[PDB]
Design a protein around this ligand. Structure first.
Ligand SMILES: *[C@@H]1O[C@H](CO)[C@@H](O[C@@H]2O[C@H](CO)[C@@H](O[C@@H]3O[C@H](CO)[C@@H](O)[C@H](O)[C@@H]3O)[C@H](O)[C@H]2NC(C)=O)[C@H](O)[C@H]1NC(C)=O
Ligand SMILES: *[C@@H]1O[C@H](CO)[C@@H](O[C@@H]2O[C@H](CO)[C@@H](O[C@@H]3O[C@H](CO)[C@@H](O)[C@H](O)[C@@H]3O)[C@H](O)[C@H]2NC(C)=O)[C@H](O)[C@H]1NC(C)=O
Ligand SMILES: *[C@@H]1O[C@H](CO)[C@@H](O[C@@H]2O[C@H](CO)[C@@H](O[C@@H]3O[C@H](CO)[C@@H](O)[C@H](O)[C@@H]3O)[C@H](O)[C@H]2NC(C)=O)[C@H](O)[C@H]1NC(C)=O
Ligand code: NAG
Ligand code: NAG
Ligand code: NAG
Ligand code: NAG
Ligand code: NAG
Lengths: 51, 108, 173, 123, 109, 173, 173
């Protein structure tokens, strides 16, 4: 027993991210299925501490 | 100016053991700090610049660790060569430079 | 060489400074330290974050059903349902992925351009009272204390006040 | 390898002037700085002066501020230590140290150290 | 007397992918893809969903002698089955319009 | 402050000029007023319009049907019809919106860059015969009549003709 | 005029050089001809190609079925199948097209910017020992042999070595 935004045959997901790659079957208001493995954007600069 | 000090001063340890002596620091001086060797007879050399990395052609038995005010030095193993006088330097604020008072290690 | 891939005018960057994204390292008598350009970071954090917020918030949501069940005499429905579901799956992968690769260059180019224009600002503020030592580091011919140094961080600087001091520099050379 | 040479030590009475020549070789002197350190007998090192490239940035320790002068020559890749008004507590060795770089940031740690030379005083 | 230009850069193992290059390390990053699941179903729309124990919708609706543990579970949000529901309908036959019944009974108050 | 976010080198702009998008404010003895750079505006209106035209004209159109009707015994079809219709509805909201949000910055940056490069053109045309008065305004040390001034608007300018005049300025200073 | 629309600072380009995309035309005594900037060409081919590789490689593929058949009494299926198939067809036309139209300007601007920054690099390497002859062509006041000229192609250049030679130039003028 808990609270879940949507379900999934394996379980449930959290947060309000716009994509997920855990299962193409869902129950509720939660995002589309994506075959990709990982994808992120950046906010800061390239991390180059020293040469 | 930025005042720095080391303590205790005199310590004798059996070779091959572990002996660490930390030098305090006013303000924070971030991670910017240098530690110098001085064997009896010749000029000082450099060991650790930035408190994280060794210099060129330096035995790796030393260890540069610490952040902010709490700055420490530790040596994995001690040989008869390591018995020298140690200086720790800060260079975050660099109109002046201030060294420590030196800590001497000896045996027999 | 990755550093050669960008071929930027600035080196890898610093780590001691913590209170900003773009800043300066003012050196002078009795005054060394780091600094941060509070005008640039706040006006650069917001736009980049809003790009992330725009991507996240525009994923509108509605209740959705799972692929239903069909008996063995109605296989046409099952494959039609697979075709539509796979069509959306293939669409979103390409659409989502190509967005975060095309817009990752946009934010990375934004950061590179932010350094350049800020670097140009100090150049134009004072021109003859400085020497191009190297990679984005000037050298003041005159003497300039902390109150003077803040003029560079401000938008204020009195050239004629220090131009006559540059005449003394002409004497040295 | 990088080698430095120093000269000009000896005995100088109070009120005189001394010039210590510090030659540089094995590295690009034009793009690198230099500095000086002083060690009294028995005590720790006390930095005195550091000068960046092209003789445009000069700094002096408060102890001797306003009475020391430093200059550099690129053609002869040597550094001088001009000074006057000798003290009685100034009997100390004077080493040569190489600044990291001019255009870099984090600056202050010294890599190469020369032997130095001894300067004393007498009544 | 120098002033220099630089940008903040702290220790970080975060990696991002772009078009000019790949596997580049950056300071701060935010993801969009979630790949973590709790591993347990939960009460979703404020109402506990019913759990079928070794039973199917047809078997339970028709009132099999088994599946008697799920009579006081009226309101729900969805129905959870077993991958191979065995105790379905006892007397064999062909349940007309089976699929439509499941969809209609998928949600009730 | 919105003006602080952009941090542009030019002020809010003028309203007197009407015959262009980028222009000048030539002033001289026996001459004043506004102008317009017919070269830049014509090459700026076309590309921006074609970007709008490209967005509008590429919406291919074809006859479409409404969501059909189904009886109570074929509910499965109705939800499948809803799933496919809602899938396209969700796609177009995100696709269309992120297009006009990402391509609005492209045009805003384009307009900002147009001012800069046009500014850069007049700086390089004459270098020592001008003073950086401030925000994109120069001051001619020499006298320059309207015929001379049009040289700035042209791509033509004779430096040696006026370099000797700048020697008189050297005498002034 | 197409060249007027772009208004680039460089002319149409050359055809003699073949071993690169950006280069130089060092001319001097006992020397002449073209050259190539191996630092930039390999650094520009990769990113542009990876943009094409990213577009092509992201087209994930899977087994697909054709539009099935239906008898005259199940026409609702046929139109539903047409609606979903036509929906994807309309999506991919606009999605694919606007990608190669928006990203064709990105690569075109990239090439234009690559010329400028490389052009800017030679200017900063030596400033007073050069005259702005015209469209991206400088003139060395001093004499510069082939060994000297490679300094421009390198990142290395000893200004004070030739600054005293520029004093001889001051004598000529
Ligand atoms: C750059 O910007 C800063 C802040 O935006 C300015 O700081 C302010 O500068 C004024 C005058 O330069 C200071 O006023 C002074 O206060 C002292 C107090 O004893 C007084 O004795 C002086 O006669 C004068 O009135 C003001 O305190 C200072 N603000 C602070 C310290 O928070 C600065 O002036 C701008 N310009 C430059 C060149 O830095
Ligand atoms: C800048 O561009 C403008 C137009 O593109 C040029 O204007 C034209 O300039 C020429 C000579 O500068 C004018 O010819 C002159 O005509 C008068 C007529 O009395 C004659 O007396 C002169 O001897 C000379 O032949 C021409 O009329 C003028 N075009 C017009 C007014 O429509 C201009 O020359 C370019 N250069 C500069 C520095 O402005
Ligand atoms: C620019 O970069 C090029 C290549 O990256 C440098 O070329 C190399 O330059 C050095 C010295 O300038 C050459 O060494 C010389 O070799 C001759 C052989 O007879 C010797 O007599 C000289 O005393 C000196 O040791 C080296 O050969 C040359 N590399 C080649 C030809 O492949 C160049 O030095 C850099 N700088 C400039 C200003 O071009
Ligand atoms: C889900 O996220 C919320 C915060 O958004 C958090 O409070 C909650 O503990 C999370 N649930 C689990 C199971 O981690
Ligand atoms: C940097 O290293 C320290 C030392 O372990 C660590 O505490 C810190 O979290 C690291 N930085 C970040 C951003 O995690
Ligand atoms: C990225 O580079 C690091 C460092 O070489 C390596 O450990 C890691 O496996 C690389 N990851 C990918 C996805 O290439
Ligand atoms: C349900 O089925 C599982 C697997 O066949 C079995 O282990 C379990 O005992 C069954 N429970 C009941 C109540 O029939
Ligand atoms: C229920 O299923 C079990 C196997 O899981 C079977 O042995 C038993 O006979 C079934 N009984 C009924 C009433 O369905």
């Amino acid at each position: 027993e808990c609270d879940a935004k949507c379900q999934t045959p394996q379980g449930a997901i959290n947060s309000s991210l716009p994509f997920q790659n855990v299962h193409p079957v869902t129950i509720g208001e939660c995002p589309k299925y994506v075959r990709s493995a990982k994808l992120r954007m950046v906010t800061g600069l390239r991390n180059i501490p020293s040469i | 100016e930025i005042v720095m000090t080391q303590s205790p001063a005199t310590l004798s340890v059996s070779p091959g053991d572990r002996a660490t002596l930390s030098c305090r620091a006013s303000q924070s001086v971030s991670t910017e700090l240098a530690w110098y060797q001085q064997k009896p007879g010749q000029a000082p050399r450099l060991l650790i610049y930035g408190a994280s990395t060794r210099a060129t052609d330096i035995p790796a038995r030393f260890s540069g660790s610490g952040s902010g005010t709490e700055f420490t030095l530790t040596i994995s193993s001690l040989q008869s060569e390591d018995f020298a006088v140690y200086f720790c330097q800060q260079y975050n604020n660099w109109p002046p430079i201030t060294f420590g008072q030196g800590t001497r290690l000896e045996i027999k | 060489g990755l550093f050669g891939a960008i071929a930027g005018f600035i080196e890898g960057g610093w780590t001691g400074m913590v209170d900003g994204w773009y800043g300066y390292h003012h050196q002078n008598e009795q005054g060394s330290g780091y600094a941060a350009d509070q005008k640039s970071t706040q006006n650069a954090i917001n736009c980049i974050t809003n790009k992330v917020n725009s991507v996240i918030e525009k994923m509108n949501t509605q209740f959705t059903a799972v692929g239903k069940e069909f008996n063995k005499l109605e296989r046409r429905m099952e494959n039609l349902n697979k075709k539509v579901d796979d069509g959306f799956l293939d669409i979103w992968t390409y659409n989502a992925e190509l967005l975060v690769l095309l817009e990752n260059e946009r934010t990375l180019d934004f950061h590179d351009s932010n350094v350049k224009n800020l670097y140009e600002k100090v150049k134009s503020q004072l021109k003859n009272n400085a020497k191009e030592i190297g990679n984005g580091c000037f050298e003041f011919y005159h003497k300039c204390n902390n109150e003077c140094m803040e003029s560079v961080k401000n938008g204020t600087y009195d050239y004629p006040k220090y131009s006559e001091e540059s005449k003394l520099n002409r004497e040295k050379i | 390898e990088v080698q430095l040479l120093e000269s000009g030590g000896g005995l100088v009475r109070p009120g005189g002037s001394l010039r210590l020549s510090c030659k540089a070789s094995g590295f690009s002197f034009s793009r690198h700085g230099l500095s000086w350190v002083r060690q009294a007998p028995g005590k720790g090192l006390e930095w005195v002066s550091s000068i960046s490239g092209s003789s445009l940035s000069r700094y002096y320790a408060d102890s001797v501020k306003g009475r020391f002068t430093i200059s550099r020559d690129n053609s002869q890749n040597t550094l001088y230590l001009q000074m006057n008004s000798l003290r009685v507590e100034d009997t100390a060795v004077f080493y040569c140290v190489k600044d990291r770089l001019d255009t870099a940031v984090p600056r202050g740690w010294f890599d190469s150290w020369g032997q130095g030379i001894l300067v004393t005083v007498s009544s | 007397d120098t002033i220099c230009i630089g940008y903040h850069a702290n220790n970080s193992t975060d990696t991002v992918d772009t078009v000019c290059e790949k596997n580049v390390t950056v300071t701060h990053s935010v993801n969009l893809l979630e790949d973590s699941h709790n591993g347990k179903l939960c009460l979703l729309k404020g109402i506990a969903p019913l759990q079928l124990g070794n039973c199917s919708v047809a078997g339970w609706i028709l009132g099999n002698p088994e599946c008697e543990l799920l009579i006081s579970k009226e309101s729900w949000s969805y129905i959870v089955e077993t991958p191979n529901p065995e105790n379905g309908t006892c007397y064999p036959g062909y349940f007309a319009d089976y699929e439509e019944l499941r969809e209609q009974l998928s949600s009730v108050s």
